[PDB]
Enzyme design. Structure first.
Site, mmCIF file in Angstrom:
data_model
loop_
_atom_site.group_PDB
_atom_site.id
_atom_site.type_symbol
_atom_site.label_atom_id
_atom_site.label_comp_id
_atom_site.label_asym_id
_atom_site.label_seq_id
_atom_site.Cartn_x
_atom_site.Cartn_y
_atom_site.Cartn_z
ATOM 1 C CG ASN A 1 -20.571 2.856 -6.724
ATOM 2 O OD1 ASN A 1 -20.704 3.920 -7.506
ATOM 3 N ND2 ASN A 1 -21.764 2.736 -6.070
ATOM 4 N N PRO B 1 -9.063 -7.416 -1.674
ATOM 5 C CG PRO B 1 -8.244 -7.004 -3.895
ATOM 6 C CD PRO B 1 -7.846 -7.514 -2.656
ATOM 7 C CB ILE C 1 -5.910 -2.071 0.969
ATOM 8 C CG1 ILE C 1 -7.220 -2.026 1.938
ATOM 9 C CG2 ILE C 1 -4.692 -0.786 1.633
ATOM 10 C CD1 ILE C 1 -6.564 -2.919 3.327
#
Lengths: 114, 114, 114
Positions: free
Chosen positions: C97, C1, C64
């Protein structure tokens, strides 16, 4: 909606009030209330467009909806227009990435918009 | 195509000519004319990778096409190679996010690429 | 991440250890190993949220997997909490986001995660 401009134009060349002018016009273009519009301008960047360093900009507009083929054409005319008139950046040295965000994929006020 | 590097490496460590190199090598790797390639290098950032502040980079490559499994493996080898050789960043402290942009979602020269 | 925070809060207001705190808490929230978590904090930005220059933040979290409606609600609570407590930014002046990245679209260590 959120609009980010990254540019090699120097800070002193960003006019007083430019973030408000972006906020206002983005509100009118997206139809969203100005309270929901965020703007971020990043001057003095080390950048190049087409191999040269004349004024240029790399931008992004993220919105939950209000993104599509016709709307994006209209936004690009508006935003290139503003970048040309206020920062003196030629429209052909501007890229704007558009992102239609899913409401579940935007966090705000401790939760998401979903 | 547009390539952005964000790094904690200091400004003085980015070699003269690095943006031209990236432009040229990306033109070659993507097959696109160099006139369409934009590059952006952001040094001196406050960053961590695995919790450590050792040299690292967070990057993005956005292109209308020329993105896919095999192409992206090849771009990653190229770009990690360049960051290692020119900025002395280990490849395992580099992340590159790839985006295949729809032509209708990229603004340029008062319209979109659609 | 990867977690990126852009804010108008000044650099001196970012507490010592804040990047480590983010890395740790993101690891726990996402279930991902801390070694894989990248954090990037960009203070002193020129920004507006709802037109005002009061403290605010525009952020992104890419991963992911581990991105979804319920997970993202939990991340937003966590991350707005941290931005409020450590940077004194109101949760209602924060946008995050979320991006669920395809493994084939993340480069690392000379290849991709695919």
């Amino acid at each position: 909606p959120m609009f980010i401009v990254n540019t090699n134009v120097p800070r002193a060349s960003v006019p007083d009030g430019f973030l408000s002018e972006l906020t206002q016009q983005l509100a009118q273009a997206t139809g969203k209330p100005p309270q929901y519009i965020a703007v971020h301008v990043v001057p003095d960047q080390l950048m190049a467009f087409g191999g040269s360093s004349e004024p240029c900009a790399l931008c992004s507009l993220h919105s939950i909806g209000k993104i599509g083929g016709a709307q994006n054409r209209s936004y690009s005319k508006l935003l290139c227009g503003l970048l040309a008139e206020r920062l003196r950046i030629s429209p052909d040295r501007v890229y704007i990435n558009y992102y239609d965000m899913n409401a579940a994929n935007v966090g705000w006020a401790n939760s998401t918009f979903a």
